[PDB]
Amino acid sequence: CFLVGAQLGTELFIVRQLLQIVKQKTNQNSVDTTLKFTLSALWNLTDESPTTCRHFIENQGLELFMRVLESFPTESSIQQKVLGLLNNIAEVQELHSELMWKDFIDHISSLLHSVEVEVSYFAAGIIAHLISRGEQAWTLSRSQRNSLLDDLHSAILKWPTPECEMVAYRSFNPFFPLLGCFTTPGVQLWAVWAMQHVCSKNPSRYCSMLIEEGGLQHLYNIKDHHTDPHVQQIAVAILDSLE
Amino acid sequence: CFLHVGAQLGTELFIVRQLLQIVKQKTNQNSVDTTLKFTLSALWNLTDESPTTCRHFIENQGLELFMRVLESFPTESSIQQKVLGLLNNIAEVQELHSELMWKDFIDHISSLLHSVEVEVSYFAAGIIAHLISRGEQAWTLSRSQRNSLLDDLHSAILKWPTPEEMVAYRSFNPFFPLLGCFTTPGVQLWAVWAMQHVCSKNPSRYCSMLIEEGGLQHLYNIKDHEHTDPHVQQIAVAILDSLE
């Protein structure tokens, strides 16, 4: 029992209502369980869902998430939930335009050099999906675009094995376009590191998934292509863990 | 990209918790605004076919809240509708039968059962229908109220006009147990009336669904059950001949 096709605007109402909970919490500098949950709620709702990403931007979720970063510069887990939702937005190619914003990129480049890999990993992701889209869709500066490409690659190699799995994925599909961005190794580097990371932490879930969705061929494509050593290194490791 | 595996369930129960807070606030302020009826819809939708969120509703005092809503806004029928329709979802969950046996609650439903708007009394009928269908042994409250309620159910349905669609369904399954309740014909009468309503205003979607889910069997079973309430039997053949 419910009221036909009336569930479409309840989830958009929900996004609107959680955003207000973020504002009222940021307003009060109240890093509490409720704020953390609301941030997690927003993250999961945007998962595999470009309509929710759009609603998040249509009500001013970027501006607000910016101001969230700024109000809680040392709260590692806050940042993570913020950047995680923002990684989902980085995935939607139509919304790429509305992330072309140096105040937003300046926040992401900052958190790329976090000593917490949990934080820096999601920053890296946002960067890789944005650099993935080529020089011609980067409406911002090319001194920053080239500089983040370098910082992204060098950052990944500073990363320890993390203790627990840091992220869940329902599908590996968004990674495949990054696997073929040979001109930008840091974008491929992030992709392979992450696949390796979830496949070593939770193979029972992710090896079957990676294989079924057609991942091996992309990985094999890297194995034989002049390619970046590090990217090729992680590449053959994942492969050999199955072949 | 999401937080962890299975995190989605934990954030659905949080949304229910937060939404109920917006209810509690708006009722505190005697405010009947857009957000409140949006919140009430959202809670209604979330309980559709989700025994789990329904149980979460109960465990976060949703019932006592919702009846504060009822007691604080007696004239706002569209509000009462959203409240009872959710409660109708809850009534559909057998493991929650104990929680709805609150005398203050049943007393209020029974009031709205006799409301003037079918858009409000329909859902109250649904709550009462589903409750009586679990039998005498399960009714832990006034055996007399239960026998009065069973007649009043039957009465208030027969006085109902044909609306201009109050409710939607994704399945007919929760009705089918009611179509068997021969000793309790009010229950049966609510089911076939409800079934007939949605089939008559949206046949393309509901008539098929009824058939796919094996509805005709239950209907034809009432047809050749020799000693069925004539009002129930009539609506049932009305439904059947609307396909046969």
Residue numbers in the entry:
A (entry chain B): 479 to 481, 483 to 704, 706 to 723
B (entry chain A): 479 to 642, 644 to 723
The study reports:
ZER1 and ZYG11B, the substrate receptors of the Cullin 2-RING E3 ubiquitin ligase (CRL2), recognize N-terminal (Nt) glycine degrons and participate in the Nt-myristoylation quality control through the Gly/N-degron pathway. Furthermore, we present the crystal structures of ZER1 and ZYG11B bound to various small Nt-residues and uncover the molecular mechanism of non-acetylated substrate recognition by ZER1 and ZYG11B.
To understand the molecular basis of ZER1/ZYG11B-mediated binding of non-Gly Nt-residue peptides, we determined the crystal structures of ZER1 bound to either SFLH-, AFLH- or TFLH-peptide, as well as the crystal structures of ZYG11B bound to either SFLH-, AFLH- or CFLH- peptide. Notably, ZER1 and ZYG11B also have the capacity to recognize the Nt-Cys, which is known to be only 50% Nt-acetylated by NatA in cells. Moreover, the Cys-GFP exhibited dramatic instability in response to NAA10 KD, whereas further double knock out of ZER1/ZYG11B was sufficient to restore Cys-GFP stability, establishing that the free Nt-Cys can be targeted by ZER1/ZYG11B for degradation. The free α-amino group of the Nt-residue forms hydrogen bonds with the side chains of Asp556 and Asn597 in ZER1 (the counterparts of Asp 526 and Asn 567 in ZYG11B), respectively. Furthermore, the carbonyl oxygen of the Nt-residue is stabilized by two hydrogen bonds from Asn597 and Trp552 in ZER1 (Asp 567 and Trp522 in ZYG11B).
